[PDB]
Amino acid sequence: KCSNFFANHWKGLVVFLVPLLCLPVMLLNEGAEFRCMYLLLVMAIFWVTEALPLYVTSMIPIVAFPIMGIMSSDQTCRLYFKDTLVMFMGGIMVALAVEYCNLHKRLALRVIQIVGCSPRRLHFGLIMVTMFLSMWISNAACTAMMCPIIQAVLEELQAQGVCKINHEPEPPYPTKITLCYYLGIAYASSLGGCGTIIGTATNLTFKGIYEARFKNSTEQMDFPTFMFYSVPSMLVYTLLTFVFLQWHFMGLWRPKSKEAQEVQRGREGADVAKKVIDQRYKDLGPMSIHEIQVMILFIFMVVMYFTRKPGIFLGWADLLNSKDIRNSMPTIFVVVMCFMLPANYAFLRYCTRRGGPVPTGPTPSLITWKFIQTKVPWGLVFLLGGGFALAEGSKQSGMAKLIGNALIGLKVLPNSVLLLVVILVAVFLTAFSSNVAIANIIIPVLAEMSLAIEIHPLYLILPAGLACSMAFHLPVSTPPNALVAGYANIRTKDMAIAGIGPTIITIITLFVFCQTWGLVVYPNLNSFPEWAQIYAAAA
Amino acid sequence: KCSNFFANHWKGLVVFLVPLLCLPVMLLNEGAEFRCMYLLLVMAIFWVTEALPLYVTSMIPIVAFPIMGIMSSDQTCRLYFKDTLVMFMGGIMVALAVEYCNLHKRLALRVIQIVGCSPRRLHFGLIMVTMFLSMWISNAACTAMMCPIIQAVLEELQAQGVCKINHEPEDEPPYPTKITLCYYLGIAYASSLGGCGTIIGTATNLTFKGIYEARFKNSTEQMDFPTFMFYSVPSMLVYTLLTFVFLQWHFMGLWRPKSKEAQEVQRGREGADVAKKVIDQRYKDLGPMSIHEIQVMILFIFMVVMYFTRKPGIFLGWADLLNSKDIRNSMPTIFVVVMCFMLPANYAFLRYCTRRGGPVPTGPTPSLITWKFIQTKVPWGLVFLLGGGFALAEGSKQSGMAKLIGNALIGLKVLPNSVLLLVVILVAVFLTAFSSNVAIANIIIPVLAEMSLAIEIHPLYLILPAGLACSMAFHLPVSTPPNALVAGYANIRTKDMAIAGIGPTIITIITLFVFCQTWGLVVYPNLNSFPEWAQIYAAAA
Ligand SMILES: CCCCCCCCCCCCCCCCCCCC(=O)O[C@H](COC(=O)CCCCCCCCCCCCCC)COP(=O)(O)OCCN
Ligand SMILES: CCCCCCCCCCCCCCCCCCCC(=O)O[C@H](COC(=O)CCCCCCCCCCCCCC)COP(=O)(O)OCCN
């Protein structure tokens, strides 16, 4: 009678108790830093527990800071909707423009055709396409985008009798082949998210927190440098994840395995069937001018990102040196040009052209605002802004001093083991809650800790920021896992066991690359830079 | 043939040509102010003609200001999503919380019980309530407050067969019917008009009162809370009554029995008794206010009170008590929004904790509102629209638009005092149609003060009419936040709103030009004369 009470109403218990239980933090101290600490604990517990929706929890600073002495109500609101957040929202809008006209389907099917259609070749192609797409699209959107293709080819194969999707007789148990495919798509989404600033919200969160805390940093996490740093590691552990998934499910390096015979009979007599369904499902027709325009706009946007401030030459944002331009001009420019440009050019038949029949009305633009209004996760505005505002309040109130001086006991550890334990803590934390919440909670703490110790702040922030996105064990860990578990009726035990591979691979790959090749990207990780010394002296 | 080309593809033609045709204003002048003037002209043309979606057009400043060198990109984005914008979005969310539970249905049924279920009487009652309420609260707050109530009233009238909410019909939202336009534009216009009643009615009044007081100390005439109300309320009542009459004439064909709109209203007038029996039956079959509705109503009342009791000028207000950091009205609004998620819907969970029987809740108890509902119903483009207004105002200040527009106003000194008053009112009305009211007040009020000092007339005689005129904007959704909120809630095309706003504009201009010269003399006897302190100020100048 009481157990099910805690089963059903534990979230309300957390909401009602946590502020009261954390009240002694304010009541037993004097400075505003302890009020900010009370707020930080309450918000962090709400984020990890998800007692309140993350978007709703993120609006707490707007109430708390003005009531306390932290900042005025105007500054707190302006902390929301920063420049980088506008860039991310515009990136989401452009990704929706790409999803409109089904450019993603065309690209995915074309690449799957280019790669072989053998079951292992199919799996490799699916992972590669999903990773490349998730580099520019939200992970959940990319997962729900790629799942239909593998689903359809699976019903085709099962109808042909080659293999069975679910075990013969609770929802049906998925077989190892379909588990491999779906888990591969989900893990590919998660891994490909880490390779770009706009790939996932977590990257933007920790990049923005680092840029806000350290404005004087010589090392900058702009779009091209971050992509340079992160792409090789992404490729390495994506390939290794694919290899592990093949070995665990499809019996790689096990010619005598039962699963190996499954793949073998899928190779003979099913390659033709699944190829045929690939071209049939590629009935999108010839490349329309609409898709071509969307592709050109997207490529132009990326090129503008790379040309903002290169060291090799000047480029824009240095020709226009009157003010800072900062990567929001290209994105919003592309978003607006999506609405300006038409999608037919059939109206040109009026001006001395034969063509065909004239249009009956106004030609549609590349995208409709109804589509944007209904497929943008607008709560990310509040979530990212709340992270930024909490970081700024922690800086201003005095949380930095308290936490840094409290956690100075880690100075005795060597840098390598400190990096290892930071990565392990980040992975363990993000295994149970949303990645953005974990980044918001830990990144300011890591910055202040690395200031207290004599450690370059990036050396701990960047590997941990990447590690916050490596969630593979539970459906609650990240939206793609929940989507896949819903699609394929994946039992939590199977996913938890299969996540051992990607977790270890990502941990080792990060721990090796951030020490070897991260030095190649930024040559100053090992030392303590001058600006870090100035910041430490100030705080 | 080629005529059909213009008929079908004129929007894209405007999009492609207007930047090119307006480029000369940039080219022939060598100033960042003229660059900003080009940007403003292009955005205004796109707004009036609706070549692009309004929300998309509001995105242009992010691209334009950094490129044009007016202001940095990080600053430009932060001018979006200001404190006031958070207040607006929170107000919309609280309105959605009211709409989630059928509280708006209850309010509409009670109001219809009170009034008598006649479209004219109901419209007049809602207009009066909105006016009196916006006398004390921010205009956008009252508009968002009243929108669900108006929706419920229209739904009830539709159910009784009195009218249709929307025209019968691919992606564009349904076109509102005449009566829907009448009611929604009515509450928007009523908010705008009632905001001019009191000092705390809207931020524009506080702004220009502060400007006058700071510029002119040692002044015999003051605009404190009682005197300003005594001066403004009669003229405001005249605005509201005449605007109501015009809205009735234009939409339901008042004084026009031949019009088809009159016939349907006359048909709806029939059978009032059976209508009221049906209405109070529909009120009765609704159960008593559930704890969901009671809690959301208590939260809404608390939010309204906190709005009113912050720096009212009559007494202390909680803002001055918590003066360590500047707290504004987004605090109570976001607090209410958060509490709408924290508080439960029912309380059966503790009911079975008391061993008082009853069915134990089988699952988590829902909160007062679900984020899925908010993500779907909030018009999120309002963020870009209202932020675009704010950022465009700030860019006008920084670039040099403010100084340039003021320099043009100096030339009006040659006109005679009555003609000068009319011209100033017209200029204020025209300017406020493209910018936030506070911005236009900041643009024109100091110039008016200096010009009045130079021409030796009482500064209030010009400041009050123009200070009030800065708030009457009824032609475009960008002109004032209430219009944008109404257009978002009920999809009102800019053509209909622009053609409907002719009435209120002319009405307000005429009644101001009359009531200043007549009634202000009753309020301020020294209004026509040039007081001694004004003489010493001019001598100092
Ligand atoms: C020097 C400065 C000092 C400053 C001090 C500030 C202190 C206050 C800080 C904020 C506190 C907020 C408290 C109000 C919100 C309480 C929410 C309780 C939710 C609730 O009833 O949950 C249920 C269990 O409740 C339970 O087991 C407990 C019973 C709860 C009964 C209602 C309690 C709240 C009454 C109103 C309080 C108003 C406070 C206003 C400030 C299960 O809910 P679920 O999990 O099924 O669903 C949850 C989603 N709906
Ligand atoms: C220091 C000084 C700096 C100065 C800077 C100045 C910048 C000026 C920029 C001007 C150009 C950008 C804005 C216009 C973009 C193109 C708009 C095309 C509109 C269009 O084609 O409309 C159709 C008719 O076009 C026509 O009849 C027009 C002729 C055909 C136009 C074709 C346009 C696409 C190809 C060229 C693109 C060039 C892009 C350059 C950035 C009818 O469309 P509809 O109304 O049926 O449907 C509309 C659905 N939205």
Ligand SMILES: *[C@@H]1O[C@H](CO)[C@@H](O)[C@H](O)[C@H]1NC(C)=O
């Ligand atoms: C920024 O860092 C440089 C060295 O990297 C230092 O010379 C300069 O004083 C710093 N500026 C501030 C404002 O701390």
Ligand SMILES: *[C@@H]1O[C@H](CO)[C@@H](O)[C@H](O)[C@H]1NC(C)=O
């Ligand atoms: C303003 O100050 C001057 C200074 O002598 C004084 O003569 C004048 O009477 C004052 N104005 C009023 C309205 O008292």
